From Swiss-Prot, chain C:
PTMs per UniProt: NMDA is probably regulated by C-terminal phosphorylation of an isoform of NR1 by PKC. Its phosphorylated state is influenced by the formation of the NMDAR-PPP2CB complex and the NMDAR channel activity.
Subunit structure: Heterotetramer; the NMDAR subunits are modular and harbor tiered domains that function in concert to regulate opening and closing of the cation-selective ion channel pore. Forms heterotetrameric channels composed of two GluN1/zeta subunits (GRIN1), and two identical GluN2/epsilon subunits (GRIN2A, GRIN2B, GRIN2C or GRIN2D) or GluN3 subunits (GRIN3A or GRIN3B) (in vitro). Can also form heterotetrameric channels that contain at least two GluN1 subunits and at least two different GluN2 subunits (or a combination of one GluN2 and one GluN3 subunits) (in vitro).
Cytoplasmic side: 71-76
Protein name (record): Glutamate receptor ionotropic, NMDA 1
Organism: Rattus norvegicus (Rat)
Tissue specificity comment: Detected throughout the brain, in brain cortex, cerebellum, thalamus and olfactory bulb.
Region of interest (Pore-forming), residue spans: 49-70
Free-text comment on this protein's domains from its UniProt entry: A hydrophobic region that gives rise to the prediction of a transmembrane span does not cross the membrane, but is part of a discontinuously helical region that dips into the membrane and is probably part of the pore and of the selectivity filter. The extracellular N-terminal domain (ATD) is a site of allosteric regulation to modulate overall receptor function.
Protein family according to the UniProt entry: Belongs to the glutamate-gated ion channel (TC 1.A.10.1) family. NR1/GRIN1 subfamily.
Record lineage: Eukaryota, Metazoa, Chordata, Craniata, Vertebrata
Residues engaged in binding glycine: S134
Swiss-Prot record, chain D:
Source organism per UniProt: Rattus norvegicus (Rat)
Protein name, per record: Glutamate receptor ionotropic, NMDA 2B
Gene: Grin2b
Membrane spanning stretches: 98-116, 151-166
Region (Pore-forming): 124-143
Stretches of the chain found on the membrane's Cytoplasmic side: 144-150
PTM annotation: Phosphorylated on tyrosine residues.
Taxonomic classification: Eukaryota, Metazoa, Chordata, Craniata, Vertebrata
Length: 101, 42, 135, 323, 49, 50
């Protein structure tokens, strides 16, 4: 999402979660997962996501399927503008042909 | 599966038969003029 | 777990305005416009100069400026099949641009974790694992 | 989970005493007392609860819980036909630079027109340049025939290019188009104002469950309006959604994704994004201070180490047009 | 002039004094839009598929 | 008028070849096949190798 030119291809090859490291029979195994449940209770985890990872930067790979842009396509218009001065030159040529015929 | 490819450098074989059907209708105009040329003698 | 790769862009090819798909063909079509105008002028020659210089391009470009219909109705039938040819030309042109726009996207994705690209370790698919990791 | 229990038979340490709960579905604190499977796991009537129950705070305080093995979360589901609106244009039709370069080419050749008019009504000529590229079929004053008449054919060729490009772009996007309308924006405001900007929404919940206590501890101002919609039965709520007598059914989205994949068609879908509003897990209830659950969780990670539950999900939890 | 109908000819056309034939010009012009739309839709349909 | 007739053509071309409804099964490991339900009646001819 942040850096472009990078996409992920498939799906969940594994399934896991992130815990908290504690040395065995620590008394602070109390209430830590309950505080995880409390952060789940108010959606404080989602507030943390809004803080950091609910910010999309690069566009999705839905497949823009196409695009509206035609910014550099006035080469037909450049051929028109080159034909304009050719028309002025041919106006002078028609003046010469009126002088002849 | 098989799939589909785009077609640039267009297959010119359509406009050849377009020209064939053009020249087919071209041949009717001369004999139509000849029938009009014979209509002046009638 | 998933797998991150580099995004490949199927570029839009916006340059097709000066290309468009025929690219060698419509020039001799435009020459046939001129010789068809010579055909009309020769049909009206023995039995209209500017209608040879004009009214051939105009009926295919949908701006009919010229001397109009010839007095010979056979040449009018020839102009009829001519502008029908012009109609199917511009219709096919639109249809093949719409075809060229959104036809194919080249394949970039792998077929998941059981890829034969992955199952056969070859040179062109360099994989990675960070050291001292759980995976 | 019966196959999970057969893998507990594979981790051979325990033999079985099956029981089907008869009073209360899960368990509810009723004046402190618990009914349900929580009422069975208290008073040592039951020891191991293998039914599809969630690990929750008011439940984990009572008894010992295992590691969660299935990621679960609360969402809603609708049976919604979708679409899009292209509001009065092609949303930004061309590149706007050429879309104003059309106005530039209206003005660059006005000088050529006013120069060849001596060879003047340039304002008439300007709407003749509008009688150009757009097919007008309106009567047009023509000059005596010169390079302006050449430029008419030039810009008519350009007109064919113009209309071809516009039609090709229009067909391109109106074939290639995504459909997302009202997934998650209303859920915290319309749904937090359920009938104040709309005809009222028939909600979908259950009578007993953790979701009711959650929604009364977070968004209790809408749960009183929700109290008219206390449908008993998941398939009954599905059929009420089929009759148009429901807005959305609030439930854990694992079962919702399973039934949406196993829907007959898939007019009935989930939210689609997968953005579960809750984030919890399904586990096993154990008696407190029972040391066996350590070795049970070791076998659970032994199951996790080879991915058999993905194969059983291919055996059990697989849909039809959930792809 | 009936051929200067449905096919977009842009050729000069003699017009009557204005009657039900001129009504039918607009009728068959609506039919012409239906015609060219159907032809272009079929052409794009098969040249994609 | 121009954008009306252009959008008309574009949406006919859209209506022509947009979707085909799903008829095919997902092979021999279909959840329609894996769960024996009422609406998918299977058959086997009697005294056969299969």
């Amino acid at each position: 999402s942040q850096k472009c030119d990078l996409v992920t291809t498939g799906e969940l090859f594994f399934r896991s979660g992130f815990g908290i490291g504690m040395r065995k029979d620590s008394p602070w195994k109390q209430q830590v997962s309950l505080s995880i449940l409390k952060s789940h209770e108010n959606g404080f985890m989602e507030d943390l996501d809004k803080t950091w990872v609910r910010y999309q930067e690069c566009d999705s790979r839905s497949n823009a399927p196409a695009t509206l842009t035609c910014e550099n396509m006035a080469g037909v218009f450049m051929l028109v503008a080159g034909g304009i001065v050719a028309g002025i030159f041919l106006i002078f040529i028609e003046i010469a042909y009126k002088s002849r015929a | 599966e098989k799939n589909e490819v785009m077609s640039s450098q267009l297959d010119i074989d359509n406009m050849a038969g377009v020209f064939y059907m053009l020249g087919a209708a071209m041949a009717l105009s001369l004999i139509t003029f000849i029938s009009e040329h014979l209509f002046y003698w009638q | 777990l998933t797998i991150l790769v580099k995004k490949e862009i199927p570029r839009s090819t916006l340059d097709s305005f000066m290309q468009p798909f025929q690219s060698t063909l419509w020039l001799l079509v435009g020459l046939s416009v001129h010789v068809v105008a010579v055909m009309l002028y020769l049909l009206d020659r023995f039995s209209t100069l500017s209608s040879a210089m004009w009214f051939s391009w105009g009926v295919l470009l949908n701006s009919g400026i010229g001397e109009g219909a010839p007095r010979s109705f056979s040449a009018r039938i020839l102009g009829m099949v001519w502008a029908g040819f012009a109609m199917i030309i511009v219709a096919s042109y639109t249809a093949n641009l719409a075809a060229f726009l959104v036809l194919d996207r080249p394949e970039e994705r792998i077929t998941g974790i059981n890829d034969p690209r992955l199952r056969n370790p070859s040179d062109k698919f360099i994989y990675a694992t960070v050291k001292q990791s759980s995976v | 989970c019966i196959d999970i229990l057969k893998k507990i038979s594979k981790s051979v340490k325990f033999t079985y005493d099956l029981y089907l709960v008869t009073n209360g579905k899960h368990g509810k604190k009723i004046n402190g007392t618990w009914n349900g499977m929580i009422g069975e796991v208290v008073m040592k009537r039951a020891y191991m609860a293998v039914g599809s129950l969630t690990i929750n705070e008011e439940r984990s305080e009572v008894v010992d819980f295992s590691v969660p093995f299935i990621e679960t979360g609360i969402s809603v589901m609708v049976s919604r036909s979708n679409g899009t609106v292209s509001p009065s244009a092609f949303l930004e039709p061309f590149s706007a630079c050429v879309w104003v370069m059309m106005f530039v080419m209206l003005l660059i050749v006005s000088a050529v027109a006013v120069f060849v008019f001596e060879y003047v009504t340039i304002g008439k000529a300007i709407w003749l340049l509008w009688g150009l590229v757009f097919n007008n079929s309106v009567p047009v004053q023509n000059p005596k025939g010169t390079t302006s008449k050449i430029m008419v054919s030039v810009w008519a060729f350009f007109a064919v290019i113009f209309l071809a490009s516009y039609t090709a772009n229009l067909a391109a996007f109106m074939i290639q188009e995504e459909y997302v309308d009202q997934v998650s924006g209303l859920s915290d405001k319309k749904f937090q104002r359920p009938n104040d900007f709309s005809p009222p929404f028939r909600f979908g919940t259950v009578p007993n469950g953790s979701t009711e206590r959650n929604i009364r501890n977070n968004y209790a101002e809408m749960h009183a309006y929700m109290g008219k919609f206390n449908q008993r039965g998941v398939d009954d709520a599905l059929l009420s959604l089929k009759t148009g007598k429901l807005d959305a059914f609030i439930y854990d989205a694992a079962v919702l994704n399973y039934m949406a994949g196993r829907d007959e068609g898939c007019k009935l879908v989930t939210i689609g994004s997968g953005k579960v509003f809750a984030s919890t897990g399904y586990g096993i209830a154990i008696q407190k201070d029972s040391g066996w659950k350590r070795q049970v969780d070791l076998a659970i990670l032994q199951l996790f180490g080879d991915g058999e539950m993905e194969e059983l999900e291919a055996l059990w939890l697989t849909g039809i047009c959930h792809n």
